[PDB]
């Protein structure tokens, strides 16, 4: 939950540009937001929140536009505060082979099972088909919107902040690529990749990609 002001101070202290004349605050903020998106992609455990999302009528559903991928759909939120029933994942192909018109089935007050495919990121199907905009908490890979101002707050963990520092070092030191043919930029990139690799807490990036559920 750190603000962008700290990260800009760090990156303006590594590069001997404190008043931000070679690297203005706007472009450093741009590198901060790009690094946040990239680090969320690399390690999904960095930035997860559960979002209340209503579902349009029909089996076919679309997750919120600024979300990379939904990992879990734990609880189906009942009307107003009631937590309601929970949801478990299932496979679409079996739902398709038998009862082929399962999309035409009568809509349900509460969805029971959802189908998700890593190939198709934005689309997940709900069984039974949703009715009248029932809301469900979604655990999805949300992407950080942007960093427009220095005081703007980054909702990410407070060590990925140092990871963002290293990534901004990469994206700034590739500008003066003439020196050492970008060796320093490659060094910062290697440092950043190692920083996320040795993250023992979150999703292990060193191990098999997408192995963690």
């Amino acid at each position: 939950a750190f603000p962008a002001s700290v990260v800009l101070s760090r990156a303006a202290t590594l590069l001997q540009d404190e008043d931000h004349e070679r690297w203005t605050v706007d472009e450093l903020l741009e590198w901060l937001t790009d690094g946040t998106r990239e680090i969320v992609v690399r390690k999904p455990s960095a930035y997860m929140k559960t979002t209340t999302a209503a579902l349009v009528a029909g089996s076919k559903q679309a997750l919120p536009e600024d979300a990379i991928q939904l990992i879990d759909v734990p609880r189906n939120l009942k009307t107003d505060g009631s937590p309601g029933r929970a949801v478990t994942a299932t496979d679409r192909r079996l739902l398709d082979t038998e009862n082929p018109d399962w999309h035409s089935m009568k809509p349900a007050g509460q969805i029971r099972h959802y189908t998700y495919d890593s190939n198709v990121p934005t689309v997940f199907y709900t069984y039974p088909p949703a009715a009248a905009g029932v809301q469900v908490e979604l655990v999805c890979a949300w992407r950080h919107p942007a960093l427009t101002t220095q005081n703007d707050v980054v909702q990410m963990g407070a060590e990925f902040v140092s990871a963002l520092v290293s990534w901004c070092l990469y994206r700034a030191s590739s500008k003066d690529s003439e020196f050492a043919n970008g060796a320093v930029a490659a060094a910062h990139y290697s440092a950043f990749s190692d920083a996320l690799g040795a993250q023992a807490t979150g999703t292990p990036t060193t191990q098999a990609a997408a192995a963690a559920a």
């Binding site: 478990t88 299932t90 496979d91 079996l94 739902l95 038998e98 009862n99 029971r112 099972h113 069984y127």
Partner: protein, 204 residues
């Protein structure tokens, strides 16, 4: 009554199985259960007269698997095979003479034919079998014998290949348990919950 009571056990042993698939497995396992246990019974009455192969009425989520007995105007009828009429009572099919009924043969799947045709009320006391597409299973199958039907359905579901559910060991284990429980319950038609004894008929 709904299959949502069966579903939790399937979820526990078959993780995240699709609801239509688990429900089809429940229906098939309960069908086999009623084939072996023969516990489900319902009573039906209709009017039959003047030479029609009348079909038995059954509940929508059921099918007449086996007739315990049939009564015709208060008479206990004797069920016999069609060849028994063929050899003992000739001109069965040809004759149209009406008379008091004595024997029943089932030429079709669900139609009962009485060796003399006559106009009278017919009461069929027969066992039932869930249909292959039944939304609600009876109280007998759900409330007290959910575990056996669940074991059979888990056998069917774990046998499904190329899926995270697939495990041959659990499939065989649940198949054996389902067979053993069905086998124990086979005698429940005669014994019942009343402990009615089973005694062989004696012919002298």
């Amino acid at each position: 009554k709904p299959l949502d009571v069966f579903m939790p056990i399937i979820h526990r042993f078959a993780p995240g199985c699709p609801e239509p698939t688990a429900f089809a497995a429940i229906r098939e396992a309960a069908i086999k259960f009623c084939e072996r246990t023969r516990l489900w019974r319902c009573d039906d009455e209709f009017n039959v007269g003047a030479d029609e192969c009348a079909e038995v009425a059954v509940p929508y989520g059921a099918a007449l698997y086996e007739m315990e007995l049939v009564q015709f105007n208060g008479r206990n009828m004797r069920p016999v095979s069609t060849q028994w009429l063929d050899e003992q009572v000739p001109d069965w099919r040809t004759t149209t003479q009406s008379g008091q009924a004595q024997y029943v043969t089932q030429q079709s799947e669900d139609t009962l034919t009485f060796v003399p045709a006559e106009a009278g009320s017919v009461r069929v006391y027969g066992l039932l079998k869930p249909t292959l597409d039944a939304d609600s299973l009876p109280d007998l199958l759900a409330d007290t014998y959910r575990k056996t039907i669940a074991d059979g359905a888990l056998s069917e579901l774990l046998i499904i290949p190329g899926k995270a559910w697939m495990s041959a060991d659990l499939a065989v284990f649940f198949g054996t348990r389902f067979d053993r429980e069905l086998d124990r319950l086979s005698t429940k038609t005669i014994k019942g919950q009343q402990r009615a004894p089973v005694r062989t008929r004696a012919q002298f």
